[PDB]
Amino acid sequence: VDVPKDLTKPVVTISDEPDILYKRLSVLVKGHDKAVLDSYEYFAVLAAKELGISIKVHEPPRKIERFTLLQSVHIYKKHRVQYEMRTLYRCLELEHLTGSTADVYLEYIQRNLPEGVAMEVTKTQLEQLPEHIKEPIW
């Protein structure tokens, strides 16, 4: 019964400047854990579908970094402890986005990026020829 009667919606103002056009966003995410990347992918794909974005997902090959250390504090060189760090990847490729749409989606998924997961977002921006290049001056 105790429900807010009216809700103040955040103000979004349509500007008079043309929006940016993104041909592609390549959202690569790195994580030590594969199950966490699977859950994040399900989140990001579901979010894209509900917002009308075209998303294609593929898994880049994992990278394992291995290094060796001495096992004992003193002498006993033959004995070593070997450690590794596994970096798993998931590449979420959006297409045909606009500056406003990209901003909203990126903020939403980046705020919900789980601990221990990094991101690299490559934004391809469609542009027009500069005015100077339209014709030669000489």
Partner: protein, 229 residues
């Protein structure tokens, strides 16, 4: 006496106009706050001050109406004038989003709910609460002790004046998420359950009472046992 003080105040207002000084919202709010001393003599003058605000263009804030209802709401059984004021104020304030204008803006809702309990009008209380829930008006409820009083008066009026089925819905929403009940409000809820002949809930009320720090309240323990037996 009031008449002399009123003449003095009016003289300052005439000095203010003479010096080309335009009154702000606080100018009128202090007059109303000052007019609280002479409670029965300032009622009509206070209404004149409010009518002057609207004409000039100064928009009454929540503090302005807080002072008015406090002035008009003195310990009297009829509450005939108070009845008219609160109903008219609520009609004006319906669906109005407020912003902080006067330091006393936070004191309106507790005073409005207090009058609704005195008049024992549940429909008016729902209008007052409705105003609190519109937009961001919930932020004007005030400090903790204000919030507890507002909700104590509000829930005590629900239990008394509303069906038990709806009272239990309000009970679940407000407690513990909105406030922690006073031992007296559990007694009112028990009395509401009695009137409704729904005594299968009494064991639950005891469990909740123990969880809200009323395990060792003598008054509450005696009421439950008496009702059950």
């Amino acid at each position: 006496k009031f008449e002399e003080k009123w003449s003095k105040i009016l003289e300052l207002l005439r000095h203010m106009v003479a010096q080309k000084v335009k009154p702000n919202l606080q100018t009128f709010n202090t007059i109303l706050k000052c007019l609280r001393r002479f409670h029965v003599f300032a009622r009509s003058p206070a209404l004149q001050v409010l009518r002057e605000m609207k004409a000039i263009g100064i928009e009454p804030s929540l503090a302005t109406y807080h002072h008015i209802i406090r002035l008009f709401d003195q310990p009297g059984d009829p509450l005939k004038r108070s009845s008219f004021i609160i109903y008219d104020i609520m009609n004006e304030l319906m669906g109005k989003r407020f912003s902080p204008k006067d330091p006393d803006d936070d004191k309106f809702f507790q005073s409005a709910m207090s009058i609704c309990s005195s008049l024992r009008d549940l429909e008016l209380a729902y209008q007052v609460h409705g105003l609190l829930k519109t937009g961001d008006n919930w932020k004007f409820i005030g400090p903790d002790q204000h919030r507890n009083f507002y909700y104590s008066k509000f829930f005590d009026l629900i239990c008394l004046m509303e069906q038990i089925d709806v009272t239990l819905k309000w009970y679940e929403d407000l407690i513990p998420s909105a406030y922690f009940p006073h031992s007296q409000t559990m007694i009112h809820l028990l009395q509401a359950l009695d009137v409704a002949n729904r005594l299968e809930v009494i064991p639950k009320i005891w469990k909740d009472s123990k969880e809200y720090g009323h395990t060792f309240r003598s008054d509450l323990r005696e009421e439950i046992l008496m009702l059950m037996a």
